[PDB]
Design a binder for this molecule. Structure first.
Ligand SMILES: *[C@@H]1O[C@H](CO)[C@@H](O[C@@H]2O[C@H](CO)[C@@H](O[C@H]3O[C@H](CO)[C@@H](O)[C@H](O)[C@@H]3O)[C@H](O)[C@H]2NC(C)=O)[C@H](O)[C@H]1NC(C)=O
Ligand SMILES: *[C@@H]1O[C@H](CO)[C@@H](O[C@@H]2O[C@H](CO)[C@@H](O)[C@H](O)[C@H]2NC(C)=O)[C@H](O)[C@H]1NC(C)=O
Ligand SMILES: *C(=O)CCCCCCCCCCCCCCC
Length: 326
């Protein structure tokens, strides 16, 4: 055998030596080297730490500025909030886990870090489809009068929750489970086990396709049809060159966020396929670890593009820093 199964735990090491145990009680030092263990948490603090002032000042820069109620900011505040739920939830759990070498809260606690990480790079996936549709409707024109605003900008934000909850809570209870992974300091969704009690088989596909492949294809459909709408379609619409100066820069940031959304998410999710297809494979702890935690950097770089490459908004932020200058 390759690893070990349990009632709640899969650990990718054979009970060959007999030093392999449960991750809910024991520090899994039997897995690898402890300096790497704390190296994960040492890399972890540098995460949580920085996801605060870059997320927090973003929620406040919008409430402070009664001038930033645009359908660009509506979707791009939704991150500042959703990430802070992770730092004050998902990251809280992982830390305690990484520093000791196991999930102490355990059966109840895994169901937090595994959940928030699934209600983070999933609620932004339902935002980054609207972020390819907000750019699509005021560039190509599918109908006549296509203005967004406020009562339209809430309809794309309140939708990201309705689609993220459709696939983040069901594993917690009812249709799947939240389970530890890799070096067993991280958690998430099952890829290894049938566990035909909670019926994973159907949930896996309903998850992967409806919430990775389909949102991507209905981003690429809205993307490929926009290089085409820049050249031959938009020279007949006859919009001005003063209007498409910042409109030619914000697009060129918004679809850089799509890139980042794959930069680490493929090394993780695409490999989550590999694991899911091999189920008894000889893939140790290191396999899922680095991609899991790199995947976890998905709370911090989002504002770092939104602040930096969206200069449109980068002025309201500097107003808090000075607070009365020339
Ligand atoms: C992999 O190897 C483990 C080695 O520890 C092994 O744990 C063994 O588990 C048995 C049964 O759970 C324990 O039996 C002891 O506990 C019962 C409680 O009622 C009592 O009869 C005695 O205290 C008895 O010793 C053993 O303590 C334990 N074996 C050793 C060598 O101490 C598991 O089989 C495996 N665990 C996994 C799947 O990670
Ligand atoms: C358990 O681990 C073994 C050992 O690596 C894996 O064996 C695979 O199948 C045969 C051995 O009979 C080899 O020719 C392959 O190269 C192995 N595959 C891989 C991943 O390289 C196997 O993955 C595991 N056993 C099963 C069938 O689940
Ligand atoms: C500039 O850098 C920010 C302003 C610096 C002073 C902030 C004062 C905060 C006081 C908060 C009390 C008002 C809250 C009630 C809102 C209705």
């Amino acid at each position: 055998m390759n690893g070990t199964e349990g009632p709640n735990f899969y650990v990718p090491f054979s009970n060959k030596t007999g030093v392999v145990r449960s991750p809910f009680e024991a520090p899994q030092y039997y897995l690898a080297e402890p300096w790497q263990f704390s190296m994960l948490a040492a890399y972890m603090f540098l995460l949580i730490m920085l996801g605060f002032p870059i997320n927090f000042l973003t929620l406040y820069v919008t409430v402070q500025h009664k001038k930033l109620r645009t359908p660009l900011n509506y979707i791009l505040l939704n991150l500042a909030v959703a990430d802070l739920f992770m730092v004050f939830g998902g990251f809280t759990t992982t830390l305690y886990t990484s520093l000791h070498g196991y999930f102490v809260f355990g059966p109840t606690g895994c169901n937090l870090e595994g959940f928030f990480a699934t209600l983070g790079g999933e609620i932004a996936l339902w935002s980054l489809v609207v972020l390819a549709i907000e750019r699509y409707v005021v560039v190509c024109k599918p109908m006549s009068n296509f203005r967004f605003g406020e009562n339209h900008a809430i309809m794309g934000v309140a939708f990201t929750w309705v689609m993220a909850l459709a696939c983040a809570a069901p594993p917690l209870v009812g249709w799947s489970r939240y389970i530890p992974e890799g070096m067993q300091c991280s958690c998430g969704i099952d890829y290894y086990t049938p566990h035909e009690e909670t019926n994973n088989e159907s949930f896996v596909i309903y998850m992967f396709v409806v919430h990775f492949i389909i949102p991507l294809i209905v981003i690429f459909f809205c993307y490929g049809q926009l290089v085409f709408t820049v050249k031959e379609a938009a020279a007949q619409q006859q919009e001005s060159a003063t209007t498409q100066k910042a409109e030619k820069e914000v697009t060129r940031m918004v679809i850089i966020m799509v890139i980042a959304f794959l930069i680490c998410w493929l090394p993780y999710a695409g490999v989550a396929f590999y694991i899911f297809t091999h189920q008894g494979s000889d893939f140790g702890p290191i396999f899922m670890t680095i991609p899991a935690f790199f995947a976890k950097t998905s709370a911090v770089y989002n504002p770092v593009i939104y602040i930096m490459m969206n200069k449109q908004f980068r002025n309201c932020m500097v107003t808090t820093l000075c607070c009365g200058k020339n």
